[model samples]
Target chain A: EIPEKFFGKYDLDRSENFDEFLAAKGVSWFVRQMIKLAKVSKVLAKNETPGKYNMENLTSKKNTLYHGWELGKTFEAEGLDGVAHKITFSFKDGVLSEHHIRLSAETYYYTIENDQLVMKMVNNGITCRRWFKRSTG
Target chain B: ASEIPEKFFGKYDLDRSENFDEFLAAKGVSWFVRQMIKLAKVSKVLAKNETPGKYNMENLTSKKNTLYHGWELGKTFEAEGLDGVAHKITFSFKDGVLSEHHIRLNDPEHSAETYYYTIENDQLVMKMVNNGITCRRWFKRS
Candidate 1:
């Protein structure tokens, strides 16, 4: 389950083995290099109206918003290759995970630990981890 | 069609960026052009209610200000992009994603560009792609 503290801004502070992870995904060399140097920031669980939550990511060059959706409801979304796939956002064991269902199966886990956002991705027997700090005003 | 919304109205200040130089390089932009854009402090402002379903947009840098009058979504018009290449620019909005398509007048098939913009967490997010290269930038409300 997500708490109220999950709502706010976060700055990606560090990443571990992200390039290798991209390589595992078969992302091109140029795109991998760009993603490695990219600034990935996010804001999650912002609810202005009732019943729906917003998850936002403002990366180095790309911005995406998953808004007005309920948890556990699977929906079709655009993938990295610009193709659509069925995905689900859910919370399990205090971690928020995105389950991407397709030929190339993958799951992304996100958690706020000690006030820092920790993200982990698992795909094709490989794992990648990253850390982010809560933005301060 | 619904009139252009006020979501994009206001000033957006460059917060940070990445891969823009490479993106321009992929588009075969001149070295001078790449350096000029790389060093510029970029910002943009959109005037609200300039006209029904249209707005005035201004892209500002330290040395220049490029203005777009009566900007309408999904309408194609001729303009120069960061590569200094003339293109038929068309901007469209769908499912909260604002897409800008640039079809090059010089080499339409080989030099086209695509850009997507969206507001996330009250911040303006832009993703530009050309020649299989992608760049991302984030801007905050100023």
Candidate 2:
């Protein structure tokens, strides 16, 4: 199930075309450089009940962003720009998908591959991917 | 006996409370967020999630805000509770009440409290037990 497969902590492993994706999101070059320097970690946890999931994107150079949701419901939440947007989620074929329903119409797909978790962010014709290794700690 | 009923949905504001001050103190709330919160009126907002029957809930006052997602018992999960401090907690829901037991991961002796919430008389009631002490609070529809 998605909960069993996706739950746990992950340490950032690598990135591909993230800077380009940031640019597509209108991130300034200078700010993007600073953002690129931060080390990131993630925690995906089950809530007190089933069918609800909570995720934390934590940076060591660090800020905290927490996302909690129920499957298939579109709810307003702050995005990459620290502004709000309607968002929905789904899990299909073992891939966890978060579809941003407004603004960039961006979508992120997370899947486990060979013990590594891959997060692919697609926006404005640019596709960026970040990989994470399941944390041993 | 089951998940919170539809009657629990909606907003409620604190009307009165007893022993809650000591409850906050025992939960290791720092003076900044903890002290100010006791005198400040808090509200409870219970929300139903669209995914079948899961639920989400929030507690708010002028000084603090916390949301609890809709449990298993005694299995630890990372949480930020009471005063926005990092801790680990276990949650269980039974007999129409939601209960949470929290303990610090690093400092196991700290942030020890068991909080429970239930509904009765169309009102929401809350309690927190720490060691041998328990605090009681009541809220009516807002």
Candidate 3:
């Protein structure tokens, strides 16, 4: 529930589909979709697990205390119109072990503690990632 | 061999538990099945079918997952103002029994969801998300 900004994925101008949006961005059809997806895009992230995931400017502590992360479709950024969710994790023993999610339709908020992170969902639960993970070594 | 069970399993004992075998047994006619969702192999195959050099599951694996495990606290109140809240919930999976025990001063709400999960040491652990707060419980045979 750290401070998060929701971003819409569509082009600002009226475009039919992704192809049109890309063209507006100066990307040609000859440009491989694979390559486009490969660009190093910046992400907004927080350290839900201080011991495990140090995303954004966050990093792990030790070289031997191996930790790693792999997110699934649960974490996909689907910018939906009517739905929103708030997620948080527990920070214990220098490890960010698990996560919790709450959904709200219009507005919500969250608070983080030394032991836990809490969030309140107003209504909507759609247009959010399925899950996310992080680790270190 | 068709009429017999696998020999690799020693001394075909219908009872799996030692002391509480009689009460803790699966039905004879019950069906047994398992599902294997290998996240790594599945991701690899997905990456292979896409970009050859640019998109790699191995690199994707290096990236962090965006979801998490969290906690929730609920309160109960009295005629005056407040009574108590759920400060602790203990889930135990011992001796083939999955049980949940919680202490609260006042009655609170209950909820459930399917997010992600794994089975380790005969324990079914789930990553549950409620109202964006996460919580987890460990199970073990005591």
Candidate 4:
């Protein structure tokens, strides 16, 4: 089960090394630039069933890609490319880890540290990180 | 719209608007809804699909009623219209003019509502026409 501290919206604060991260994923320059300019937030909502969580990346000032995941379970999610990617999620030792099972070894790990939600993206020896602060809304 | 998507596809902030409340009134929006929209900060983002000429876009607002649409140039698609109703919309870009022709699904008596988006002085200028009333909205690159 996720902790109560992880609830609420995490507003995007800043990003580092995302251009290299996008380039490594083969995102087009046009799309990458668009993404870099747009800010996003995440809502760690509670699921109707216990231990299951509803998480959606929200960007009204920005793309909302929606998904729901439970800890320690493998699931399939549709990517922006319209392909389904298998993924497993776990929250261990104060970190929420996303283990993506795909052709490329790209993954994401998120943790709440220093009162900020920090997300680290890993792919091909490159680790891109972004920071978010808890929103009052 | 430009042959180069970079000219149009990106994040935009709505900084200026003229007669938009009137435009919403013409579109049959309620007083509260108009006030809510006018009171909030709005932003738009556009992204291109892998398929040529197809794109996905979203309008984010500090208020409620966020919108999303996926459209292809010169093709009809189902999306929310300015009147806050789902309808058929066809978009086209020609000679630097990006336009959306919105047609209600069941109503044929009413004429189609047309909106135009153009770039002038490095700003996205959006206009809507309704029964001789024209409303203009402006957006700047974010």
Best by TM-score: 1
Tell me the native contact fraction for each prediction: 0.00, 0.00, 0.03, 0.00
lDDT order of candidates, top first? 1, 4, 2, 3
lDDT of 4 by residue, B98-135 (tens): 77686654345375778787878888788877856788
lDDT per residue as tens, model 2, B23-135: 55555545554544555566787776555445556655432235656423444555431111244556667788877676643344644766787888988888866655677
* Per-candidate interface DockQ score: 0.01, 0.03, 0.04, 0.02
Query: Candidate 4 residues A1-137, lDDT tens each?
Result: 67788777888888899888767755556556656666667777776667677665654322343345678877654321112345677888888886765323455788888888888877766688988899974
Model 2's CAPRI class is incorrect
User: What value does the lDDT take at residue A108 in candidate 4?
Assistant: 73
DockQ of 1: 0.01
Q: Docking category for candidate 1? A: incorrect
RMSD of 4: 16.8
Window of ten residues with lowest summed lDDT in model 1 chain A = A76-85
Chain A TM-score for candidate 3 is 0.21
Q: Each prediction's Cα lDDT score?
A: 0.65, 0.63, 0.24, 0.64
Q: What is the lDDT, from 0 to 100, of the residue B91 in candidate 2? A: 61
Candidates 3 and 4 compared: the better one by DockQ is 3
For model 4 chain A, the run of ten residues with the poorest summed lDDT: A76-85
Candidate 3 per-residue lDDT over residues A1-137, each given as its tens digit: 22322111111111123343334434335542422222111123433563333332111100111123332112211100101122233433322323323221122222333222222222222221111111212
Ranking by DockQ: 3, 2, 4, 1
